Amino acid sequence: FRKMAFPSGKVEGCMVQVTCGTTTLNGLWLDDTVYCPRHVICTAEDMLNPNYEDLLIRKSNHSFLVQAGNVQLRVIGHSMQNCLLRLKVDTSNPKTPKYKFVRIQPGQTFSVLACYNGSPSGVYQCAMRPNHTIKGSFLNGSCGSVGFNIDYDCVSFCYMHHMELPTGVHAGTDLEGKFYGPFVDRQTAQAAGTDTTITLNVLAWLYAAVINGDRWFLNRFTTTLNDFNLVAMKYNYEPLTQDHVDILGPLSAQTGIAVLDMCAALKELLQNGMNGRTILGSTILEDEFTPFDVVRQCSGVTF
């Protein structure tokens, strides 16, 4: 059970390079608008606490160089939206896929197309952690890189990269420029809150295991939601809610295993370990596969 990312062709067609002065990063070109992190108008020593509003005033459309492949895209407009810049260009992107902007919630996953200079370099799966950060992989010049999900034929853009936090984790915005978490785009002292294991996803993974035919961890018992939370919270698991139980409904129905029954199985796995045994070839409980990813991978969903 590999951690599969969505085919990235559709997003690759929307990546461009955006340069302002000496600062170059990636931009998202949909129709006649290019979205990129606002910190692109910042210079070397201008990132400790930049006054973006006053920094933008001193800019004009000519301040921005937008390149797609080897062609220059003419900027005929520019406005700031929260932590992003919205540059209007004179050419509607011919590769614009059907799409929408959605704000992802804690625990949910998406694919990241890591880019540099407007050229996609790699794609991997990520999970928005409960502490509102993502355990990604980004180098210098990656910002404006984007996270997404594909639902049918519609590309749902949910993330744009801006920062790396002191613990080696990452923070960014939805495509409205609003940050996930309490982070701000300034090189001040900021720290991620402590994280927890995404219980919902672990349960989902256990179902995938069962679906695959890997079911040794199952048992004859069940448990109350409250009794499960008391155990799970020792191993630093996110408290399980009824809403989570309901989200797991389709998988529970596919396998005929009640959620609280799987919780009883998970419980026993936490207090007794795996005994060297393995689940889906893993020696640990995966927490970055959602009930949807599970459905997607086991069902051969295509786009």
């Binding site: 790396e164 002292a189 900021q190």
Partner: peptide, 5 residues
Amino acid sequence: XAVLX
């Protein structure tokens, strides 16, 4: 210590 990407 946040670093802008």
